[PDB]
Design a protein around this ligand. Structure first.
Ligand SMILES: CN1C(=O)c2ccccc2NC(O)=C1[C@@H](OO)c1ccccc1
Ligand SMILES: CN1C(=O)c2ccccc2NC(O)=C1[C@@H](OO)c1ccccc1
Ligand SMILES: [Br-]
Ligand SMILES: [Br-]
Ligand SMILES: [Cl-]
Ligand SMILES: [Cl-]
Ligand code: NI
Ligand code: NI
Lengths: 288, 288
């Protein structure tokens, strides 16, 4: 079996999206620097510790899919300086997304989440993403360009032993799913800061944690066309935090109007022909 | 040629969506009471008068499609008490939308706009809606249930002479568009408060104003699945106005989390497993 193509964030930038379009998966080596990974980890650490079980009885939007041991923290903008500055303005992320979504137009964050898998976390069932939030995606024609992609960034080592991601290469082009099996998968062995990039059609799963000692952490960034509703809201993020961001970061968090690729585009989230940012006189790059 | 089916808002409620699903169009007689139409007209009147041309050079999201004579006013919640109370809580609208979008899940307002057509306004080209904002819609399978519907509510008389809407019945099921012609259309002759309901696949157009004296006004309410991004934003609507609304109205304006029809739905616009309304402690039905 062919292994997941491994590409440089520095040199092979133009090759990344074409590789994912062909194979359905690619490893971006050093997608984030170890400095950014260190700062991300430090900032989200306490929020991961206080996070209840995914299907906690206190929640009015419980996640009944994720294992009880799993901890997911989303809406990272108010938590993490490293996320809202370094990650949301990543030159590599924005080149890949502009390559991926040019047919549709503007893209934004459907969800940026830190996931921590506790020791002995079982393997997820093989799946395509978006099926528990966007039923519309299943009604797209087979040859429809991907409407979302998922950056799975290692914040700790991904090994075969501690539950590194499984992917079926070429599975993003599959219509008949009779050959779906763990037998057909290859592993995303990754150092902290490496990213596994998949599409919403790539068949994949979290691996089994088999050591019983290792805690595995990842930053999952689902980037999707601005025509699809995000899984997470930034509506409650304080305006000072939003006004500290770049205009691009503001757009990614839904604090700006959006544009389609239609030649005479009439726009999304507009206010009587004017943008959110113009109407509300929204400042950008104002330090806290 | 068969005329557009005409249905009672009072009696034929369960028949409305099935009729639109079959024929692609239906007239809902007295969708809004003349009292609601009167109050809507009074409240939006000044905002229509101050509205610049659709492609005004002052706008950063100009509409290059609509005729220079046309005036479109959206984000009606802050303008109109009648809209935010009576229209957004319409029992008829909510039954039709729940019938239409049950396969997908929650729905909301993609755009609520008052359109005023000046005397001698030319006929629009025959078209399907959403092609200038949501390119994704064109990539849906032919048998995909409609992801948006458009309520075209008469706020003044619709006559053949003053440019009443044209529709091609059955055109919502068309894949080959070689027979698209004004020869194949029938007219939506409507009294104020009557509504023409079409899908995002129904081929239709605004009619030609041929008198040179009559101004025609309509309330266009595009209702769409919560998985699709609205054309308009309510982000700048004052919180007091939002807190005066029903929870249902708040959801329709994107001031609440949303749910898909997926058996184990994980939700849209959520905040770490909690809703917008729970997180922000958003009050409902608090008078101004
Ligand atoms: C349920 N669920 C998530 O919560 C999720 C989490 C982070 C990013 C994207 C996500 N979307 C998604 O579709 C799933 C799915 O994982 O990607 C899934 C399927 C089957 C088993 C375990 C997970
Ligand atoms: C451009 N445009 C609008 O602005 C619009 C206005 C109100 C409601 C929905 C709308 N969406 C839409 O798709 C069109 C389209 O009309 O529905 C269209 C096409 C061709 C000619 C004139 C209009
Ligand atoms: Br994983
Ligand atoms: Br019309
Ligand atoms: Cl899990
Ligand atoms: Cl027009
Ligand atoms: Ni997944
Ligand atoms: Ni139209």
């Amino acid at each position: 079996k062919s292994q997941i193509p491994r590409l440089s964030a520095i040199n092979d930038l133009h090759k990344i999206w074409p590789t994912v379009e062909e194979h359905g998966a690619a490893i971006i080596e050093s997608f984030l620097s170890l400095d950014i990974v260190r700062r991300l980890n430090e900032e989200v650490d306490p929020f991961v510790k206080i996070e209840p079980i995914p299907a906690a009885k206190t929640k009015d939007h419980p996640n009944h899919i994720l294992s009880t041991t799993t901890r997911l923290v989303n809406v990272l903008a108010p938590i993490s300086k490293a996320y809202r500055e370094d990650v949301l303005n990543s030159k590599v992320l924005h080149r890949i997304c502009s390559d991926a979504f040019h047919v549709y137009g503007d893209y934004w964050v459907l969800m940026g989440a830190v996931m921590e898998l506790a020791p002995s976390n079982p393997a997820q069932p093989l799946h395509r993403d978006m099926r528990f939030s966007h039923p519309i995606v299943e009604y797209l024609k087979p040859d429809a360009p991907a409407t979302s992609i998922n950056f799975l960034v290692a914040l700790s080592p991904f090994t075969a032993e501690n539950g590194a991601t499984h992917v079926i290469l070429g599975s993003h082009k599959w219509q008949n799913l009779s050959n779906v099996s763990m037998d057909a998968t290859v592993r995303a062995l990754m150092n902290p800061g490496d990213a596994l990039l998949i599409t919403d059609s790539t068949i994949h799963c979290g691996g089994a944690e088999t050591t019983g000692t290792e805690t595995r952490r990842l930053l999952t960034i689902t980037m999707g066309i601005s025509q699809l509703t995000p899984l997470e809201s930034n509506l409650a993020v304080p305006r000072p935090v939003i006004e500290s961001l770049t205009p691009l970061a503001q757009r990614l968090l839904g604090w700006a109007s959006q544009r389609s690729a239609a030649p005479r585009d009439i726009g999304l989230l507009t206010i009587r022909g004017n943008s959110i940012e113009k109407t509300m006189n929204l400042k950008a790059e104002q330090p806290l």
